[PDB]
Amino acid sequence: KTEVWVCENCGHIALEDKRRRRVYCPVCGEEERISKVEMSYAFKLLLDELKAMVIRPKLNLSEKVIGSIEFGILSPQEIRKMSAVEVTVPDTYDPIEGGVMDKRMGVIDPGLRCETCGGRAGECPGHFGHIELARPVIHVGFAKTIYRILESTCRECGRIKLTDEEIEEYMKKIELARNRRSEFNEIIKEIHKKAKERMVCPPIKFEKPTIYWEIRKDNEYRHRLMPTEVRDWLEKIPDKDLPLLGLDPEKSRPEWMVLTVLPVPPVTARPSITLIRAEDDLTHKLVDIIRINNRLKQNIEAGAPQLIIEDLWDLLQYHVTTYINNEAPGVPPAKHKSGRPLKTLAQRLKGFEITVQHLFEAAEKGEVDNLNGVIENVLIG
Amino acid sequence: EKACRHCHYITSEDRCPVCGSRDLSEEWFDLVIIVDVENSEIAKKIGAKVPGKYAIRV
Amino acid sequence: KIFAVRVTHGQEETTAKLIYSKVRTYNLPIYAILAPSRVKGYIFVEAPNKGVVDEAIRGIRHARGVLPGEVPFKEIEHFLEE
Ligand SMILES: [Zn+2]
Ligand SMILES: [Zn+2]
Numbered sequence: 001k002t003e004v005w006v007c008e009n010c011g012h013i014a015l016e017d018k019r020r021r022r023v024y025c026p027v028c029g030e031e032e033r034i035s036k037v038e039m040s041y042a043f044k045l046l047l048d049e050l051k052a053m054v055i056r057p058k059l060n061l062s063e064k065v066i067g068s069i070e071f072g073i074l075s076p077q078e079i080r081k082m083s084a085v086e087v088t089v090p091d092t093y094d095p096i097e098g099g100v101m102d103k104r105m106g107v108i109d110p111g112l113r114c115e116t117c118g119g120r121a122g123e124c125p126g127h128f129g130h131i132e133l134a135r136p137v138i139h140v141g142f143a144k145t146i147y148r149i150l151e152s153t154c155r156e157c158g159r160i161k162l163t164d165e166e167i168e169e170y171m172k173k174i175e176l177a178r179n180r181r182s183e184f185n186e187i188i189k190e191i192h193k194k195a196k197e198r199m200v201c202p203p204i205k206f207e208k209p210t211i212y213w214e215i216r217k218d219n220e221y222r223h224r225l226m227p228t229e230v231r232d233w234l235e236k237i238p239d240k241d242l243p244l245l246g247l248d249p250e251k252s253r254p255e256w257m258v259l260t261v262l263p264v265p266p267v268t269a270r271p272s273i274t275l276i277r278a279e280d281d282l283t284h285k286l287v288d289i290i291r292i293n294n295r296l297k298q299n300i301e302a303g304a305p306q307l308i309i310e311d312l313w314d315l316l317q318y319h320v321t322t323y324i325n326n327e328a329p330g331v332p333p334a335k336h337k338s339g340r341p342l343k344t345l346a347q348r349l350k351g352f353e354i355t356v357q358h359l360f361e362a363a364e365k366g367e368v369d370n371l372n373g374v375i376e377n378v379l380i381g
Numbered sequence: 382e383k384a385c386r387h388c389h390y391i392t393s394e395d396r397c398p399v400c401g402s403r404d405l406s407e408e409w410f411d412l413v414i415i416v417d418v419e420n421s422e423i424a425k426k427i428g429a430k431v432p433g434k435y436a437i438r439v
Numbered sequence: 440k441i442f443a444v445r446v447t448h449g450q451e452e453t454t455a456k457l458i459y460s461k462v463r464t465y466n467l468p469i470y471a472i473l474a475p476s477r478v479k480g481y482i483f484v485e486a487p488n489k490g491v492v493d494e495a496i497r498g499i500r501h502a503r504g505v506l507p508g509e510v511p512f513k514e515i516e517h518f519l520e521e
């Protein structure tokens with residue numbers, strides 16, 4: 001059992017400065033309305049993987065207890081705000097650094113020093129770090145969703161490829177079946193197929209696991225859609241159009257699905273199985289992400305033969321994709337020198353056992369889980 | 382490895398063989414390798430007429 | 440044509456020199472090679488045919504791959520200039 005400081009303003013997990021006696025939200029800058037919620041480490045850990053998974057568990061309170069959790073897609077601003085540090089060094093401890101280990105990230109060994117909080121190894125929940133990504137990278141979990149949105153919306157302007165006539169009737173049709181999940185998805189697929197077959201502004205698309213194209217003529221020259229094109233292309237779609245797709249204007253902007261900032265989990269989530277120590281799989285891939293990310297930034301800041309940037313960008317995407325889901329379809333599984341495949345995020349948050357497909361649909365739609373009538377004791381109250 | 386201060390030719394000797402200058406610098410950068418002069422586009426842009434080890438930043 | 444060729448960390452200058460060994464000494468038509476210090480883990484090879492590059496790098500230690508496509512000369516002048 002662990003007490004967790006939850007922000008009343010924005011439902012984020014607030015910081016407790018043990019050293020300065022300061023409890024406050026890093027995200028929305030709240031200092032007064034913050035409550036201490038009793039919780040199982042099981043569930044604090046669960047919340048923390050979700051966060052590292054770019055999913056936003058918005059905590060809603062009742063009474064000093066969580067009434068509900070609204071699912072969403074964490075914004076770069078949020079990811080940056082919730083971060084205690086910008087992780088830079090692809091190094092383990094060798095014994096602490098400026099990289100993947102307690103660079104204000106969390107204490108785990110006899111060296112109590114921390115992120116102002118200076119709380120001893122013995123009970124200090126870690127703090128998230130962050131990697132600023134040289135180039136945007138598709139969040140693997142949202143690939144198929146991006147595909148749908150991409151093929152169902154227009155280039156250059158960004159409209160849902162439906163007549164204002166269609167929108168008036170459909171937005172109204174949605175409102176009706178907004179509550180019922182199964183028939184709302186019956187209408188989502190209908191809208192898609194209907195805009196997917198259109199080609200006039202009021203080229204086609206290809207996939208897997210994160211690769212997109214647009215077939216253009218001159219002759220089927222298939223133009224590859226790069227994350228910056230895909231991202232900016234999606235930043236266009238107005239909030240107005242978002243409900244004609246799975247997405248929510250506040251909780252899940254489409255652009256947020258192509259990563260710009262990748263949260264680095266707190267140290268407590270990534271413990272080493274010490275004996276030359278058995279460093280945690282999540283820390284290993286995080287070393288590999290930074291390793292490439294700096295190699296990218298290097299060749300970006302230097303000369304840009306593009307063919308190189310592409311090769312590296314595609315590799316940064318790879319590393320992020322394996323870190324998000326090593327068991328991903330169309331992804332050669334990252335293995336350690338032995339052949340044993342790494343067990344990453346998706347491998348962790350699935351046995352609290354969680355079917356990932358469901359997680360993404362939640363965050364997409366901005367689904368609200370409630371914790372009240374037939375209460376779960378495996379998450380404390 | 383020391384690169385000449387005029388023609389740029391990186392050599393191990395006490396003198397650059399191509400021209401014969403004794404002025405050889407240690408802090409050089411950006412390696413360029415030449416096999417053919419007549420066919421290679423690389424030699425044209427720089428202005429090197431002898432195949433072998435040439436440098437950029439000296 | 441300039442072909443981008445993958446190389447291992449630091450091994451830039453070394454594999455650049457090593458590739459030069461299998462060129463005329465084995466009868467392979469590579470025109471030139473570019474190993475810039477600001478470039479990390481990649482080597483440019485001036486060759487006419489794609490076979491030329493594939494044949495050169497083959498059997499060369501710490502020279503991982505060869506890039507799908509060709510680098511336009513304009514994109515390469517930058518390093519050569521300085
Ligand atoms: Zn807050
Ligand atoms: Zn701490």
Ligand SMILES: [Zn+2]
Pocket residue numbers: 154155157158159200201202
């Ligand atoms: Zn349009």
Ligand SMILES: [Zn+2]
Pocket residue numbers: 385386387388389390397398399400401402
């Ligand atoms: Zn000389």
